[model samples]
Target: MVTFHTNHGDIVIKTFDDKAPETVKNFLDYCREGFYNNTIFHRVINGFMIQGGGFEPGMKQKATKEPIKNEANNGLKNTRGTLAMARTQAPHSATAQFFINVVDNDFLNFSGESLQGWGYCVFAEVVDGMDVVDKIKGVATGRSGMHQDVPKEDVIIESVTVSEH
Candidate 1:
C-alpha cells in the first residue's frame, strides 16, 4: 500500500501487483524516486477524475522517462476509487501521469486489442482517505494553457510513501 499525502488530505492506495505487475512496478519506480513530491493535482474534473504526477505548479509538465506499456488488458476496471495510469492519445504513452476515478467509468475499460481500446491501466485502488479525493474533486476548476478543469488553487501532493517497502 502507498499513501499519497496531499494538501487536501491523505489517500491510501493498494497496488494490484498480481494483476498489473508492469504498471505497478512503473508506479513504484516513481514512488521510490520521489518523482511525485511537491507536484500538484493539475487537473480535477468533478464528474471525471483528478489527475496529477505529471505537471508542476505552473502547469509545466515535468520531464519523465520512457513510457510504459498499456496494461489495461489485465482485467482491471476503471471504477470509482481505482487508480489508473494516465496516457496520451497513444495508449502506451503513459509514463508518470495518473488519475483517481471518482465515479464508475466503464468507458475507460479495455474492450479489445486495438490501441485505443486498450484503455487506461488500473494498477491501484484507494483503500482509505476517499474523502480527501472527494475534497480535491470538489475544488473550483477552470482553464489553463491547453488544459481544462484545472484547479484554480493548487492541490499539492506533499509526499508519497510506500508501506510495503
Candidate 2:
C-alpha cells in the first residue's frame, strides 16, 4: 500500500501486485524517486477520471523513461475508485501517466484493435479519501485545445510517499 498526499487530500492506493507487478513497481519507482512531485493533474473528466503524474502546470509534456507493456489483460477493470495507467493510442505507451476512475468506466476496459478500444491497465484502487476524488470530479472544466476536460484550477499532486505497510 502507498499513500499519495496531494493538495486535494490524502489517497491510499493498494497496488494489484499479483495482477500488475511490473506496472506497480514502475509507479512505485517513480514515487520513490520524487518524479511526481509538483506535477499537476493534466487531465480531468468529470464522469471519467483525473489523470496526472506526467505533465507540468503549463501542459508541457515531461520526458519520461521507457514505457511498460499493456497489462490490461491482467484482469483489472476500470471500475470506480480503481487506478489505471494512462496511455497513448499505442498499447504499450503508458509510462508515468496514471488516472483514478471517478465512475465505472467499462468502455475503457475493452479489448481489440478498434480505434477506441485499446484498453487501459488498472493497477490499484483508492483505499482512502475517495471523497476528495469526488470533490475533484465536481470541479468545473474548460476547453483546452480540442480537449474540453481540463480543470479550471490545477489539481496538483503535491507528493507521493510509500507507506511502511
Candidate 3:
C-alpha cells in the first residue's frame, strides 16, 4: 500500500503489480525515494481526475527518470478511483506523472495498438480516503501559465509512505 499524506488528507493506494508489474515498480521506486514530496496536484478537474507528481507548489515542473512502457493493454479500465500514468501524445512516454480518476473515464482505456488507441496505463487504485480525493477535485481552479484547472489554493502532497502487508 502507498499512503499519500496531502494538505487536504490521506489517500491510500493499492497497486496492481500482477497486472502492471513494471508500472507498479516504477511508481513504488518514486515513492521510496520521496520523489512525490512537496509536489502539488497541478491539475484538478471536478468529476474528472486529479494529476500530479511532476510539479512543485509554484507550478515548477520537476525532473523525472526515463519513460516507462505502456501498460494500458493489461485490460485495466480507467474507472473511478483508479490511478493511471499521465503521458503525452506518445504511447510510451509515461514517467513520474500520474492521475486519479474521480469518475469513470472509459475513453482512457486501451482500444487498439494504434497511436490514438494506446491509452493511459492504469496501474493502481485508491483503496481508501476517496473523500479527500473528492474534496481536492472540487477545489476552485484557474489557469497557471500554460496549464489550466490548477487549484487556487495549493493541494500539496506532503509525502508518500509505502509499506508491505
Candidate 4:
C-alpha cells in the first residue's frame, strides 16, 4: 500500500497498477525517493479535489524527471477518494503531481482520443483516511500569489511511504 502521511492526516492509497502500470510505478518511485516529504498540497478545491505532490512549500513547482503516458482510458473513473495524475493540457503530460477526488468527478475521466476527452489518469484509491482527505478539503482557501484555490494554512505533506500491506 502507498500511504501519504500529510499535515492533515494519513491517507492510504491502493494502486490500480493492474490497470495503470506505468502510472503506479512512477508514483511508487516518487514515494521511495521521499519526493513528497514536506511538500504542500498546493491546490484545494472544496467540492472538487485536493492536488499536490509536485509542489514544494510556497507554491513552488518541483522539477520532475519526464512526463508519462495518459492512462485515463484504463477503465478508471475519477470518483471520490480516488487518486489521479495531474497534467498539463497535453494528454501525456502527467508527472508526479496528483489529486484525490473530493467528490465524484466523472468529467475528468477519459472519453476518447480527442484533446478535450483525454482526461486525468486515475491510478489509485483511498483505502484509509477519507476523513483526512475531507479535513484537508474542508478548509479555508484563497489565492496564493498567482495560484488560485490554494489552502491558506499550507497543508504540508509530512511524508509518504510504501508499506507492503
Candidate 5:
C-alpha cells in the first residue's frame, strides 16, 4: 500500500502490483521523487473522474520523463475508486497524467480499439479517503476555449508522498 496526501485529504491507494507491475512501479517512483508536487487537477468531470499530475494551475503543461509502455492489457478494469493513467490517441503516450475514477467507468477498461473504448490502464484504487475523491468529482467546471471539460477552480495536488506497507 502507498498513500498520497493531497490538499483535500489523504488517499491511500492499494496498488495492484501483481496486476500491473510496470505501471504501479512507474507511478510509485514518481510519487517517491516528488514529481507530483504542486500539480493541479487539470480535468474534473462530475460523476466521472478527477485528473491531474501533468500540469500546473495555469494550464502550463510540465515536461515529463519518458513514458512507459501501455499496460492496458493487464486485465485491470476502470471501476469506481480506481486510479488509471491518462493518455492521448497513441496508446503508449501516457506519461504522468492520471485520473481517479469516482464512478465505474467500464469504457476505459482493456478492450480492442473502438470509439468508446480507450483501454486506459488501471494501476491502483482508493483504499482510503474516497470521500475526498468524491468531493473533487463534484467541483464546478466550464468551457475553457474549445474544451468544455476543464475545471473552473484549481484543484491542486499540493504533494504526493510515498508510504510503505
Candidate 6:
C-alpha cells in the first residue's frame, strides 16, 4: 500500500501488481525516488479525475525518466477510485504522471491493440481516504496557462509512504 500525504489529506492506494506489473513498478519506483513529493494535483475535474505526479506548485513541470508501455489491456476498468497513468496522444508515452478516477470512465479502458484503442493503464485503486479525494475535487479550479481544470488552491502531495504487506 502507498499513502499519499497531501494537503487535502492522506489517500491510501493499493497497487494491482498482478494486473499491471510494469505500471505498478514504475509508480513505486517514482515513490521510492521521492519524485512525487511536493507535487500538486495539477488537474482536478470534479466529476472526472484528479491528476498529478509530474508537476510541482505553480504548474512547474518536472523532468521524468523514460516512458513506460501501456498496460491498459490488463483486465481493469477506469472505475471510481481507481488510479491510472496519464499519457499523451501516444499510447506508451506515460511516464510519471497519473490520475485517480472520481467516476467511472469506461471510455478510457482498452478496446484493442491499435493506437486509439490502447487506453490509460489502471495500476492502483484508493483503499482509503476517498473523502480527501472528494475534498480535492471540490476545490475551486481555473485555467493555468495551457492546462485546464487546475485547482486555484494548491492540493499538494507533501510526501508519499510506501509499505509492504
Model 2 per-residue lDDT tens digits across residues 1-165 = 888788899888999887998899899999898888888777788888988888778776788999998888876799999999988888888899899999999988958645566699899999899998898888888877875677888888888878645
Candidate 5 local lDDT, 7-124, one digit each (tens): 7887788888888888888898888888888887878888888888888777878888888878888878888999999988887788889999988998778776553454899999
Best lDDT among the predictions, by candidate number: 3
Runs of candidate 4 exceeding 4 Å displacement: none
**TM-score for each prediction?**
0.97, 0.91, 0.98, 0.96, 0.90, 0.98
- Error at 37, model 6, angstroms: 0.4
- The parts of candidate 2 lying over 4 Å away from their true place are 110-118
Poorest 10 consecutive residues by lDDT, candidate 3: 156-165
TM-score of 6: 0.98
- Give a tens-digit lDDT track for model 4, residues 82-143: 99999999999999999999999998999998799999899999999999998998889899
Candidates ranked by lDDT, best first?
3, 6, 1, 4, 2, 5
> What are the lDDT scores of the predictions, listed in order?
0.91, 0.85, 0.95, 0.90, 0.82, 0.94
Model 1 ranges off by over 4 Å = none
Better of 1 and 3 by TM-score: 3
RMSD, every candidate, angstroms: 1.0, 1.9, 0.7, 1.1, 2.0, 0.7
Q: Write the per-residue lDDT of candidate 3 for residues 28-62, one digit (tens) a residue.
A: 99999999999999999998999999999889998
Residue 156 lDDT in candidate 5: 76
Local lDDT at 121 for model 5: 93
Ranking by TM-score: 3, 6, 1, 4, 2, 5
What overall lDDT, based on C-alpha atoms, would model 2 receive against the true structure? Answer: 0.85
Task: Estimate the TM-score for candidate 4.
Answer: 0.96
Give the TM-score comparing model 3 with the true structure, all chains together. 0.98
